[PDB]
Amino acid sequence: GMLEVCIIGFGFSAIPLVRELARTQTEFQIISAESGSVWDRLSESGRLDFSLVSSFQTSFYSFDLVRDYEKDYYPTAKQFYEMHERWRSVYEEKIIRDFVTKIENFKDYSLISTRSGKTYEAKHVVLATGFDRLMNTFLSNFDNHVSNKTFVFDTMGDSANLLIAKLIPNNNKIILRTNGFTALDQEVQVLGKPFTLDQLESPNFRYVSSELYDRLMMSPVYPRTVNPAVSYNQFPLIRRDFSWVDSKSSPPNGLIAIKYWPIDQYYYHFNDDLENYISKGYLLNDIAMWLHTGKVILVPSDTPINFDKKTITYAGIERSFHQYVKGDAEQPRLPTILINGETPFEYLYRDTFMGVIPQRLNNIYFLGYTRPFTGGLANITEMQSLFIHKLITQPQFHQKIHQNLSKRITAYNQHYYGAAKPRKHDHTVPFGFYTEDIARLIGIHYQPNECRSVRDLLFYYAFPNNAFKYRLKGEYAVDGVDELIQKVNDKHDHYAQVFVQALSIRNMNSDEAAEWDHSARRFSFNDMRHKEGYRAFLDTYLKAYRQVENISVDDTVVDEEWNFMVKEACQVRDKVAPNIESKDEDVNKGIRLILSILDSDISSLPDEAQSIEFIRRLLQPKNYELLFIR
Ligand SMILES: Cc1cc2nc3c(=O)[nH]c(=O)nc-3n(C[C@H](O)[C@H](O)[C@H](O)COP(=O)(O)OP(=O)(O)OC[C@H]3O[C@@H](n4cnc5c(N)ncnc54)[C@H](O)[C@@H]3O)c2cc1C
Ligand SMILES: NC(=O)c1ccc[n+]([C@@H]2O[C@H](COP(=O)([O-])OP(=O)(O)OC[C@H]3O[C@@H](n4cnc5c(N)ncnc54)[C@H](OP(=O)(O)O)[C@@H]3O)[C@@H](O)[C@H]2O)c1
């Protein structure tokens, strides 16, 4: 009569697993802290006044999307929290409010200790406890009445970018003292229509060849184009050292990106009702517009600073600042876990299988410790939830995965990390590799060889690998996913543009593909040609923000020392930007060809002529093997 499952921590990550355990009537208990999460801190202090950096389709679960999806949008922080609270309310009767202090792991059960002193025995234990993040305080607590101060950031990430969005409108000057950072427009115009960047990744093209996929994806990350319109050419300090990368899989696991509103897309969405959109949490966070306008400056990583005087020395200027912001040492909130009830478990992402199954522990699973490169967490945690549910409820599956666990882990690490040493961001994966890897392990994947029509090929290769893609049919089918996929296909032209992109670069080398990617009137990422024209909009924006936030600040004060630092900062840009002056034309022809053979039988396509041949060979991709599954 021992408890079959104990889930520790209930916020967001645990929802889909609890839903599947309920469906199979598997006995479970949830234990979760009375104190809740950062989302409760932000709710309590009235600071749910921002929006997600991820699309609806990747940030909410399949069983919500089938009801509530009518169009792409970026949810607000308020909507995200409201959804956590709705699901909390569904499962509250299954939640014990307490805090787990210790887990003793035995051969086929665990002893869970709590701060109350109550103990629990459970055959299977799932940890969904999230992360402690140092920067959460800056969001939950730090003040909006600071003005004309200098901030120094040693780190750039989504949390820094959100703080910078809130600081800039109070004429706070931002110095970024960095080893580089990857920033990407969260939204792109494709023939007039907005696509979130997660929709453009067509990840199953990795199976055609890693080199094809690499030149399709990596030109905005690695400094491959000489095009003077690209932020990494106007502001070379943004470039990172990627010498650590030792994998043929691109983008590599361990690559992080900050996702941001470019001001042109911000204007297209919000220009009509600006004050009301800002009050909902749609905040302009265009880092490239900040670099362009000098409201942010980059300085070298080894730039000298004096923590005692609160001074940084740049442009022969000893420069004084109100705050230095170090940046996150973000790590899982794990209680002490005792192996054989004796030896403390040591957590390392790479030593777990798919970030879920730790070694040396029996029937313990980790849920929510894998971070998506792009898109929302929902895609990751939905698929992790199905994997965990199958391991808990199907001993045949549990035995299959565990029998060769150490060899699977080795084969995964070889494929994705190679000989690179563990890094603090190992837990970050391309979402469309991870979801597909789990789907193949579970057996709810699609087979490329079973596509019959060109349409079927578009769905396999070009429809994004969102978790709901794998819940149309088979073991984990969700009612309404058919109608969801239809709605999404109908609105994005079946992802024909994405498909044609790969068709267009199949013969190119990586340098040719990089130039082609940037030959558009507006390329997807970091296009500095689409900033100057929005300066008037920016002033309308700052006024609307100030008005929403009851701020007064006069834009007359002149920080001549800043100007000199900005001028020193923006010197490569003042050389390169005057040098300014195929993708659009090629895409147009490609989409015409594809939409016209949509319902054509693939296997029977005849021997633009050579693009049909390549299309036919997509039935037999030569790079399909994943040795951690086989
Ligand atoms: C500022 C911010 C912005 C974000 N923006 C986005 C976004 O745009 N898109 C997106 O997809 N994701 C975003 N995320 C990430 C992610 O969606 C959230 O971090 C989410 O809260 C993770 O859910 P979780 O359930 O893993 O953890 P949490 O939501 O933190 O919930 C875990 C729960 O477990 C409890 N707990 C912890 N330890 C114990 C213990 N020992 N015993 C008992 N209970 C315990 C905690 O109190 C908490 O209530 C953002 C995160 C932050 C902080
Ligand atoms: N769906 C999601 O899960 C999701 C998505 C987006 C945002 N978020 C939220 O926003 C936050 C984003 O992370 P964070 O701001 O807390 O800190 P972080 O991104 O974990 O840390 C950023 C640091 O990582 C290093 N880094 C290494 N490679 C980099 C690259 N290519 N680009 C940029 N930085 C790189 C840099 O420091 P060094 O160079 O000094 O090592 C940088 O300062 C999350 O904590 C989360 O709260 C969640």
Coordinates of all heavy atoms in Angstrom, one line a residue, residues 53 133 154-160 179-182 240 242 255-259 328 330 371-372 375-377 423-425, ligand 2:
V53 N 8.9 36.2 -23.8 CA 9.8 36.3 -24.9 C 9.5 35.1 -25.8 O 10.2 34.9 -26.8 CB 11.3 36.2 -24.4 CG1 11.7 37.4 -23.5 CG2 11.7 34.9 -23.8
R133 N 17.2 31.9 -9.1 CA 17.8 32.9 -10.0 C 18.1 34.2 -9.2 O 17.1 34.8 -8.7 CB 16.9 33.1 -11.2 CG 16.5 31.9 -11.9 CD 15.7 32.2 -13.2 NE 15.7 31.0 -14.1 CZ 14.7 30.1 -14.3 NH1 13.6 30.2 -13.6 NH2 14.8 29.1 -15.1
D154 N 27.7 42.8 -16.2 CA 28.8 41.8 -16.6 C 28.1 40.7 -17.4 O 28.9 39.9 -18.1 CB 29.6 41.3 -15.4 CG 31.0 41.8 -15.2 OD1 31.3 42.8 -15.8 OD2 31.7 41.3 -14.3
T155 N 26.8 40.6 -17.4 CA 26.0 39.6 -18.0 C 24.9 40.2 -18.9 O 24.3 41.2 -18.5 CB 25.5 38.6 -17.0 OG1 26.3 37.4 -17.1 CG2 24.0 38.3 -17.1
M156 N 24.7 39.6 -20.0 CA 23.5 39.9 -20.9 C 22.7 38.6 -21.0 O 23.3 37.5 -21.3 CB 23.9 40.3 -22.3 CG 22.8 41.0 -23.1 SD 22.0 42.2 -22.1 CE 20.6 42.7 -23.3
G157 N 21.4 38.7 -20.8 CA 20.4 37.5 -20.9 C 19.0 38.1 -20.9 O 18.9 39.3 -20.9
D158 N 18.0 37.3 -20.8 CA 16.6 37.8 -21.0 C 16.3 38.6 -19.8 O 15.6 39.6 -19.9 CB 15.6 36.7 -21.3 CG 15.7 36.1 -22.8 OD1 15.5 36.9 -23.7 OD2 15.9 34.9 -22.9
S159 N 16.8 38.3 -18.6 CA 16.5 39.0 -17.3 C 17.1 40.4 -17.4 O 16.5 41.4 -17.0 CB 16.8 38.3 -16.1 OG 15.8 37.2 -15.9
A160 N 18.4 40.5 -17.8 CA 19.1 41.8 -18.0 C 18.4 42.7 -19.0 O 18.1 43.9 -18.7 CB 20.5 41.6 -18.4
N179 N 31.6 39.3 -22.7 CA 32.4 38.5 -23.6 C 31.6 38.1 -24.9 O 31.9 37.1 -25.5 CB 32.8 37.2 -22.9 CG 33.8 37.4 -21.8 OD1 34.9 37.9 -22.0 ND2 33.4 37.1 -20.6
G180 N 30.6 39.0 -25.2 CA 29.7 38.8 -26.3 C 28.3 38.3 -25.9 O 28.2 37.9 -24.7
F181 N 27.3 38.3 -26.8 CA 26.0 37.8 -26.5 C 25.3 37.6 -27.8 O 25.6 38.2 -28.8 CB 25.2 38.6 -25.5 CG 24.9 40.0 -26.0 CD1 23.8 40.3 -26.8 CD2 25.7 41.1 -25.6 CE1 23.5 41.6 -27.3 CE2 25.4 42.4 -26.0 CZ 24.3 42.6 -26.8
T182 N 24.4 36.6 -27.9 CA 23.5 36.2 -29.0 C 22.1 36.8 -28.7 O 21.5 36.3 -27.8 CB 23.5 34.7 -29.2 OG1 24.8 34.2 -29.3 CG2 22.8 34.3 -30.5
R240 N 30.9 36.5 -29.6 CA 31.2 35.6 -28.5 C 32.4 34.7 -29.1 O 32.5 34.6 -30.3 CB 30.1 34.7 -28.1 CG 29.2 35.4 -27.0 CD 28.5 34.4 -26.1 NE 29.3 33.8 -25.1 CZ 29.6 34.2 -23.9 NH1 29.0 35.3 -23.4 NH2 30.4 33.5 -23.1
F242 N 33.2 31.1 -29.6 CA 32.5 29.8 -29.7 C 33.5 28.7 -29.9 O 33.1 27.6 -30.3 CB 31.5 29.9 -30.9 CG 30.3 30.8 -30.6 CD1 30.1 32.0 -31.3 CD2 29.4 30.5 -29.6 CE1 29.1 32.8 -31.0 CE2 28.3 31.3 -29.3 CZ 28.2 32.5 -30.0
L255 N 24.1 26.7 -26.3 CA 24.0 28.1 -26.9 C 22.8 28.7 -26.3 O 21.7 28.1 -26.3 CB 23.9 27.9 -28.4 CG 24.3 29.0 -29.3 CD1 23.2 29.3 -30.3 CD2 24.8 30.2 -28.6
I256 N 22.9 29.9 -25.8 CA 21.8 30.7 -25.3 C 21.6 32.0 -26.1 O 22.6 32.4 -26.7 CB 21.9 31.0 -23.8 CG1 23.0 32.1 -23.5 CG2 22.3 29.8 -23.0 CD1 23.0 32.6 -22.1
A257 N 20.4 32.4 -26.2 CA 20.0 33.7 -27.0 C 19.1 34.5 -26.2 O 18.3 34.0 -25.4 CB 19.4 33.3 -28.3
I258 N 19.2 35.8 -26.3 CA 18.2 36.7 -25.8 C 17.3 37.1 -26.9 O 17.8 37.4 -28.0 CB 18.9 38.0 -25.1 CG1 18.7 39.3 -25.8 CG2 20.4 37.7 -24.9 CD1 17.3 39.8 -25.5
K259 N 16.0 36.9 -26.7 CA 14.9 37.1 -27.8 C 14.3 38.4 -27.5 O 14.0 38.7 -26.3 CB 13.9 36.0 -27.8 CG 14.3 34.7 -28.5 CD 15.3 33.8 -27.7 CE 14.7 33.4 -26.3 NZ 15.7 32.5 -25.6
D328 N 23.4 35.7 -13.4 CA 22.8 34.5 -12.8 C 23.9 33.4 -12.6 O 24.6 33.2 -13.6 CB 21.6 34.0 -13.5 CG 20.3 34.6 -12.9 OD1 20.1 34.4 -11.7 OD2 19.6 35.3 -13.7
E330 N 22.5 30.4 -12.1 CA 21.1 29.7 -12.1 C 21.3 28.2 -12.0 O 21.9 27.7 -12.9 CB 20.4 30.2 -13.3 CG 19.2 29.3 -13.7 CD 18.8 29.4 -15.1 OE1 19.6 28.7 -15.9 OE2 17.9 30.0 -15.5
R371 N 16.3 23.7 -20.5 CA 15.9 25.1 -21.0 C 15.9 25.1 -22.6 O 16.9 24.6 -23.2 CB 16.9 26.2 -20.6 CG 17.2 26.2 -19.1 CD 16.7 27.4 -18.3 NE 17.0 28.6 -19.0 CZ 16.2 29.7 -19.1 NH1 15.0 29.6 -18.6 NH2 16.6 30.7 -19.8
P372 N 14.8 25.6 -23.2 CA 14.8 25.7 -24.6 C 15.6 26.9 -25.1 O 15.6 27.9 -24.5 CB 13.3 26.0 -24.9 CG 12.8 26.7 -23.7 CD 13.6 26.1 -22.5
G375 N 11.7 29.6 -28.1 CA 10.3 29.1 -27.7 C 10.2 29.0 -26.2 O 11.2 29.2 -25.5
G376 N 9.0 28.6 -25.7 CA 8.7 28.5 -24.3 C 9.1 27.2 -23.8 O 9.4 26.2 -24.5
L377 N 9.1 27.1 -22.4 CA 9.4 25.9 -21.7 C 8.4 24.8 -21.9 O 8.8 23.7 -21.9 CB 9.4 26.3 -20.2 CG 9.9 25.2 -19.3 CD1 11.3 24.7 -19.7 CD2 10.0 25.7 -17.8
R423 N 29.7 22.9 -19.2 CA 29.5 24.4 -19.0 C 28.2 24.6 -18.3 O 27.3 23.7 -18.3 CB 29.4 25.0 -20.4 CG 30.7 24.8 -21.3 CD 30.5 25.3 -22.7 NE 30.2 26.7 -22.8 CZ 28.9 27.3 -23.0 NH1 27.9 26.5 -23.1 NH2 28.8 28.6 -23.1
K424 N 28.1 25.8 -17.8 CA 26.9 26.2 -16.9 C 25.7 26.2 -17.7 O 24.6 26.0 -17.1 CB 27.2 27.5 -16.1 CG 27.2 28.7 -17.0 CD 27.3 30.0 -16.2 CE 26.0 30.5 -15.7 NZ 26.2 31.4 -14.5
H425 N 25.7 26.3 -19.0 CA 24.5 26.3 -19.9 C 24.4 25.0 -20.7 O 23.5 25.0 -21.6 CB 24.5 27.5 -20.8 CG 24.3 28.8 -20.0 ND1 25.3 29.7 -19.9 CD2 23.3 29.3 -19.4 CE1 24.9 30.7 -19.1 NE2 23.6 30.5 -18.8
Ligands
LIG2 N1 11.5 29.4 -22.0 C1 12.4 29.6 -21.1 O1 12.9 28.8 -20.3 C2 12.9 31.0 -21.0 C3 13.3 31.6 -22.2 C4 13.8 32.9 -22.1 C5 13.9 33.6 -20.9 N2 13.6 33.0 -19.7 C6 13.7 33.7 -18.5 O2 14.7 34.7 -18.7 C7 16.0 34.4 -18.1 C8 17.1 34.3 -19.1 O3 18.4 33.9 -18.4 P1 19.0 34.9 -17.3 O4 18.9 36.3 -17.8 O5 18.5 34.6 -15.9 O6 20.6 34.6 -17.3 P2 21.3 33.5 -18.3 O7 20.8 33.8 -19.6 O8 21.3 32.2 -17.6 O9 22.9 34.0 -18.2 C9 23.5 34.9 -19.2 C10 25.0 34.7 -19.2 O10 25.3 33.5 -19.9 C11 26.6 33.7 -20.6 N3 26.5 33.3 -22.0 C12 27.1 32.3 -22.6 N4 26.8 32.2 -23.9 C13 26.0 33.3 -24.2 C14 25.3 33.7 -25.5 N5 25.5 33.1 -26.7 N6 24.5 34.8 -25.4 C15 24.3 35.5 -24.2 N7 24.9 35.1 -23.0 C16 25.8 34.0 -23.0 C17 27.0 35.1 -20.3 O11 28.0 35.2 -19.3 P3 29.5 34.7 -19.4 O12 29.9 35.0 -20.8 O13 30.2 35.6 -18.4 O14 29.4 33.2 -19.0 C18 25.7 35.8 -19.9 O15 25.9 36.9 -19.1 C19 15.8 33.0 -17.4 O16 16.5 32.9 -16.1 C20 14.3 32.9 -17.3 O17 13.9 33.5 -16.1 C21 13.1 31.7 -19.8

